[PDB]
Symmetry: C2
């Protein structure tokens, strides 16, 4: 039985109309063009990208150091500034396709859509969850820096991610549009310690509820673990602590299974499934959120 | 270690600009508006959708039976015709956002992108493989009929799917734009036998090669099975017969592992992984194609 659950991304139209190519000397990557501002990673200023002095690089630059092309036009740069790990270029024309938008920060376990681009040309879209160590399991190649991740509320786009790097274990990180990197990472071509990932408990619970909404419920016993008792279990077992939400509450209402019944389940399943399947998997799945389950299986925003 | 592989869809921009809402009396669904033609499922003509007479319904209709709204305008219908399970409405204005496009038929194991829509409003994009029983494991709700699936070559969009139904096991099917349904299915609200699914061998091979390109290769032995010998194995074991492609050939070249080495591997792994993992899974994965692996891990179109 198929669960109705797929990795689903927002439609990328509105964001595609905001992507440009930024070139500063030898280096070329993607930017995001909203109003009269173009955002892009600052290492576009760098030739030898290990321990570089972006402050010195920045001052070395004038407005004519930066070339910005729209492929999906040429924008004249009339300003330049650095904010954390991003450049903030000002251009003479405002993007007439600028969406209604905000900037935001995504939190571990939250999902968002990524528009992957090369040379300012949109090439693919996918959706990820911010992991607990502030990486994502994306699909990025050389030239992908500057691709953006975003959520959408109504017609408003919430930009949350500008892509910056691949870590040794093949995951990816980038920055928020305040210029801070997610996690403790730095935008230099240096060795960095990746933190440990954890299962996202709220999302494993969402998934068990998705199984239930598909008729799969052998793992539900009457037993129960309190959130508090579970959260002390979690800290010893590479699970995040669990924090409930109204979205998880809707699922408990629709199915009549209590959060605490599944917290207990997680505790048992972690040790072993015992040769059984859950939604065609034999390991806990934490890549779907309570909102994904509410929307895709029940129609609920 | 993360493999760099995600379920990746084309950017949906060009197609979003082609989606409209079609309403005929009580029933509302999505259409695809290219040039002066709007395509939509024919059961929009139906009130009691079991054993309906579309031929009689069709004749019962005039041009003023059909209302077509663009939300992402109102199009006057000046023609109407039925082709298999689709209506072909002619409208007075041609879509000025019409992409370069073709129609095509997708084959089992091939991947494509779906733009899911409600009331003519794009709401999500995802990517699927056409299964061997001509269903897809999608994410569709009431009102989703008329959403479209498509591939993309260069700037040309290859429309291959217009969504029609959910089968009892939770999978989905629809038609090609010649109006034929995929598989033996019919667009009536009646019981239908679903055929058996099979593992897609070419795609399990692509996946084992993706593991190899990520350093994971414990399952590679020197042993070998011929395609022919494997294809006779497959017919007894719910695998598709394997047909190689140049894309699978590139992977064999880049890694120096022979197709036949992995065909043998599949044969052993099918019985059991023996408590080992492959790319973080413990079952064979057939949802990624040789082209997905070539593009996402190596940059190769």
């Amino acid at each position: 039985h198929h669960s109705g659950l797929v990795k689903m991304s927002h439609p990328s139209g509105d964001v595609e109309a905001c992507m440009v190519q930024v070139t500063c000397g030898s280096m070329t990557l993607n930017g995001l063009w909203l109003d009269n501002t173009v955002w892009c990673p600052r290492h576009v200023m760098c030739p030898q990208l290990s321990d570089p002095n972006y402050d010195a690089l920045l001052i070395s630059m004038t407005n004519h150091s930066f070339s910005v092309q729209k492929h999906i036009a040429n924008l004249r740069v009339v300003g330049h500034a650095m904010q954390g790990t991003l450049l903030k270029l000002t251009v003479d024309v405002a993007n007439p396709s600028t969406p209604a938008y905000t900037f935001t920060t995504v939190k571990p376990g939250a999902a968002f859509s990524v528009l992957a681009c090369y040379n300012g040309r949109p090439t693919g879209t996918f959706t990820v969850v911010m992991r607990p160590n502030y990486t994502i399991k994306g699909s990025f190649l050389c030239g992908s820096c500057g691709s953006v991740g975003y959520t959408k509320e109504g017609s408003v786009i919430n930009f949350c991610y500008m892509h910056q790097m691949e870590l040794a274990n093949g995951t990816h990180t980038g920055s928020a549009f305040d210029g801070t990197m997610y996690g403790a990472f730095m935008d230099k071509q240096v060795h960095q310690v990746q933190l440990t990932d954890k299962y996202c408990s709220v999302n494993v619970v969402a998934w068990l509820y998705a199984a239930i909404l598909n008729g799969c419920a052998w793992f539900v016993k009457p037993n129960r673990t309190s959130v508090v008792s579970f959260n002390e279990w979690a800290l010893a077992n590479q699970f995040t602590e669990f924090v409930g939400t109204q979205s998880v509450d809707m699922l408990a209402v629709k199915t009549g299974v209590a959060i605490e019944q599944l917290l207990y389940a997680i505790q048992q399943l972690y040790t072993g499934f015992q040769g059984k399947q859950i939604l065609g998997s034999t390991m806990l799945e934490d890549e779907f959120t309570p909102e994904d389950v509410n929307m895709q299986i029940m129609g609920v925003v």
